[PDB]
Design an enzyme around this catalytic site. Structure first.
Site, PDB file in Angstrom:
ATOM      1  N   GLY A  97       0.856  -1.075   0.374  1.00  0.00           N
ATOM      2  CA  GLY A  97       0.043  -0.093   0.038  1.00  0.00           C
ATOM      3  C   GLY A  97       0.920   1.227   0.066  1.00  0.00           C
ATOM      4  O   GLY A  97       0.333   2.355  -0.099  1.00  0.00           O
ATOM      5  N   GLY A  99       3.145   2.253  -2.420  1.00  0.00           N
ATOM      6  CA  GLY A  99       3.310   2.985  -3.518  1.00  0.00           C
ATOM      7  C   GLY A  99       4.149   2.310  -4.491  1.00  0.00           C
ATOM      8  O   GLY A  99       4.601   2.917  -5.591  1.00  0.00           O
ATOM      9  N   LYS A 100       4.782   0.929  -4.510  1.00  0.00           N
ATOM     10  CA  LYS A 100       5.343   0.415  -5.329  1.00  0.00           C
ATOM     11  C   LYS A 100       5.170   0.248  -6.529  1.00  0.00           C
ATOM     12  O   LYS A 100       5.724   0.567  -7.692  1.00  0.00           O
ATOM     13  CB  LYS A 100       5.794  -1.092  -4.740  1.00  0.00           C
ATOM     14  N   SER A 101       3.855  -0.140  -6.783  1.00  0.00           N
ATOM     15  CA  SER A 101       3.191  -0.403  -8.420  1.00  0.00           C
ATOM     16  C   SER A 101       2.987   0.886  -8.788  1.00  0.00           C
ATOM     17  O   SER A 101       3.018   1.039  -9.873  1.00  0.00           O
ATOM     18  CB  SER A 101       2.099  -1.410  -7.943  1.00  0.00           C
ATOM     19  N   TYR A 102       2.470   1.783  -8.141  1.00  0.00           N
ATOM     20  CA  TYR A 102       2.026   3.039  -8.649  1.00  0.00           C
ATOM     21  C   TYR A 102       3.462   3.664  -9.226  1.00  0.00           C
ATOM     22  O   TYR A 102       3.364   4.185 -10.259  1.00  0.00           O
ATOM     23  CB  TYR A 102       1.736   3.942  -7.462  1.00  0.00           C
ATOM     24  N   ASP A 245       8.996  -5.142  -8.908  1.00  0.00           N
ATOM     25  CA  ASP A 245       8.165  -4.604  -8.175  1.00  0.00           C
ATOM     26  C   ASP A 245       8.143  -5.578  -6.879  1.00  0.00           C
ATOM     27  O   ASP A 245       7.423  -6.574  -7.116  1.00  0.00           O
ATOM     28  CB  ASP A 245       6.751  -4.314  -8.839  1.00  0.00           C
ATOM     29  N   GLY A 248       5.488  -7.016  -0.807  1.00  0.00           N
ATOM     30  CA  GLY A 248       5.416  -5.804   0.406  1.00  0.00           C
ATOM     31  C   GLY A 248       6.310  -6.331   1.870  1.00  0.00           C
ATOM     32  O   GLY A 248       6.696  -7.748   1.986  1.00  0.00           O
TER      33      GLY A 248
HETATM   34  N1  LIG Z   1       2.800   9.047  -5.488  1.00  0.00           N
HETATM   35  C1  LIG Z   1       1.459   8.915  -5.456  1.00  0.00           C
HETATM   36  N2  LIG Z   1       0.337   9.600  -6.064  1.00  0.00           N
HETATM   37  C2  LIG Z   1      -0.933   9.359  -6.097  1.00  0.00           C
HETATM   38  N3  LIG Z   1      -1.337   8.063  -5.787  1.00  0.00           N
HETATM   39  C3  LIG Z   1      -0.367   7.328  -5.479  1.00  0.00           C
HETATM   40  C4  LIG Z   1       1.188   7.404  -5.415  1.00  0.00           C
HETATM   41  N4  LIG Z   1       1.610   6.357  -4.754  1.00  0.00           N
HETATM   42  C5  LIG Z   1       0.615   5.655  -4.597  1.00  0.00           C
HETATM   43  N5  LIG Z   1      -0.579   5.724  -4.890  1.00  0.00           N
HETATM   44  C6  LIG Z   1      -1.932   5.183  -4.690  1.00  0.00           C
HETATM   45  O1  LIG Z   1      -1.933   4.514  -3.604  1.00  0.00           O
HETATM   46  C7  LIG Z   1      -2.477   3.290  -3.828  1.00  0.00           C
HETATM   47  C8  LIG Z   1      -1.404   2.274  -3.394  1.00  0.00           C
HETATM   48  O2  LIG Z   1      -0.144   2.241  -3.976  1.00  0.00           O
HETATM   49  P1  LIG Z   1       0.460   1.020  -4.745  1.00  0.00           P
HETATM   50  O3  LIG Z   1       1.387   0.980  -5.729  1.00  0.00           O
HETATM   51  O4  LIG Z   1      -0.966   0.081  -5.193  1.00  0.00           O
HETATM   52  O5  LIG Z   1       0.928   0.078  -3.335  1.00  0.00           O
HETATM   53  P2  LIG Z   1       1.858  -1.122  -3.249  1.00  0.00           P
HETATM   54  O6  LIG Z   1       2.127  -1.662  -4.668  1.00  0.00           O
HETATM   55  O7  LIG Z   1       3.079  -0.837  -2.588  1.00  0.00           O
HETATM   56  O8  LIG Z   1       1.024  -1.970  -2.504  1.00  0.00           O
HETATM   57  C9  LIG Z   1      -2.956   3.008  -5.405  1.00  0.00           C
HETATM   58  O9  LIG Z   1      -4.552   3.059  -5.305  1.00  0.00           O
HETATM   59  C10 LIG Z   1      -2.249   4.312  -5.851  1.00  0.00           C
HETATM   60  O10 LIG Z   1      -3.143   4.873  -6.761  1.00  0.00           O
HETATM   61 MG   LIG Z   2       1.608  -3.522  -5.694  1.00  0.00          MG
END
Ligand SMILES: Nc1ncnc2c1ncn2[C@@H]1O[C@H](COP(=O)(O)OP(=O)(O)O)[C@@H](O)[C@H]1O
Ligand SMILES: [Mg+2]
Length: 329
Positions: A97, A99-102, A245, A248
């Site tokens: 949660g 922001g890795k995937s984002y 990616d 967690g």
């Molecule tokens: N820099 C950012 N700006 C806007 N939204 C972001 C950003 N980084 C993450 N998010 C949002 O936060 C949520 C979680 O990020 P996500 O990449 O899914 O987490 P992870 O891959 O680490 O589990 C998503 O719903 C995504 O759209």
């Molecule tokens: Mg992810």
């Protein structure tokens, strides 16, 4: 540099909104500070990195680290290194949660495309603008998930789950029967990305929650063929680009085997990167580092972007991530 490390804090997510969470992360220049919500009267713990990206607000803010800014600092230079003939790797690390995937894949609208699509678009843009008939190229792609020491081919729905990493007696590690597709345009590689990303979140992935408990590895094999007007001979230059990616970091409700493997993987990767930073290595301690050994060697360039939740409720995990990123230096 051999190793570059960046951290990035995102906007509050739904869980944090529901808890009326306070932001405990602050950034200035290359520094990130974190406040302990239970000891607010203290001087916050400080950390310095190659980059500290403030992405806690939104693109409407003048001070918001955009997808474009992140790519241009880390992605662009890694691509440049690839064109020079060396291997590169970029890892996204952090709590589920965070922001890795984002950061790595991002989204589509308002062009929130992450590092991978931007790097791919940049790669093809540079190739097509090539105005030298002695230069030709080949781009091959593989997209997989590493879960509990097994590899899943995200570009082949039929195969499913199972592949094993093997060590060729002379040519290094490889995933047996893993698809490696030749792509001749950005649209085509984007179709593959979309298809693979789709595979990561289909309904059945929620059984073992592989979108957050597996390591997704997007590999590009970039071959540059240089022709010689005289002699008519062609010398090749192959560069391997690995965009990862990671699973967690809080998972290092978790199955004993899952946690053991994720812990071992993330821990070994940390040891590897720290060693690489020291020179400027137990690769087989984990499948992830074993498969990526050649991308984590003396000649290679690696970068890590550690994602951070801005919230008070994740203090412990966020501090752990900052310390992990700090060690990788
Ligand atoms: N820099 C950012 N700006 C806007 N939204 C972001 C950003 N980084 C993450 N998010 C949002 O936060 C949520 C979680 O990020 P996500 O990449 O899914 O987490 P992870 O891959 O680490 O589990 C998503 O719903 C995504 O759209
Ligand atoms: Mg992810």
């Amino acid at each position: 540099a051999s190793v570059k490390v960046a951290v990035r804090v995102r906007p509050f997510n739904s869980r944090e909104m529901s808890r009326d969470s306070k932001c405990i992360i602050q950034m200035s220049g290359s520094t990130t500070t974190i406040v302990n919500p239970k000891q607010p009267k203290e001087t916050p713990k400080s950390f310095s990195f190659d980059y500290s990206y403030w992405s806690h607000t939104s693109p409407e803010d003048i001070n918001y680290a955009s997808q474009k800014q992140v790519y241009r600092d880390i992605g662009e230079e890694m691509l440049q290194h690839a064109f020079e003939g060396y291997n590169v790797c970029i890892f996204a690390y952090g709590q589920t949660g965070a922001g890795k995937s984002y950061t790595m894949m991002g989204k589509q609208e308002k062009d929130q495309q992450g590092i991978i699509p931007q790097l791919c678009e940049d790669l093809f843009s540079r190739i097509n603008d090539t105005t030298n008939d002695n230069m030709s190229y080949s781009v091959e792609v593989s997209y997989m998930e590493i879960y509990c020491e097994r590899v899943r081919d995200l570009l082949n729905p039929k195969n499913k789950g199972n592949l094993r990493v093997r060590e060729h007696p002379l040519l290094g590690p490889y995933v047996e029967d893993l698809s490696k597709l030749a792509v001749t345009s950005y649209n085509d590689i984007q179709d593959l990305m979309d298809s693979g990303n789709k595979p990561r979140t289909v309904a059945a992935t929620n059984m073992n929650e592989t979108s957050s408990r597996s390591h997704a590895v997007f590999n590009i094999i970039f071959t540059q063929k240089r022709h010689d007007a005289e002699t008519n001979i062609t010398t090749e230059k192959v560069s391997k680009i690995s965009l990862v990616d990671l699973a967690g970091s809080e998972r290092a409700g978790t199955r004993l085997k899952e946690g053991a493997n994720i812990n071992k993987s993330l821990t070994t990767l940390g040891k590897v990167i720290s060693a690489l930073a020291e020179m400027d290595i137990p690769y087989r301690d984990s499948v992830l580092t074993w498969l990526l050994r050649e991308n984590l060697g003396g000649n290679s360039r690696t970068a890590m972007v550690a994602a951070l939740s801005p919230a008070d409720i994740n203090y412990d995990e966020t501090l752990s991530t900052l310390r992990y990123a700090d060690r990788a230096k």
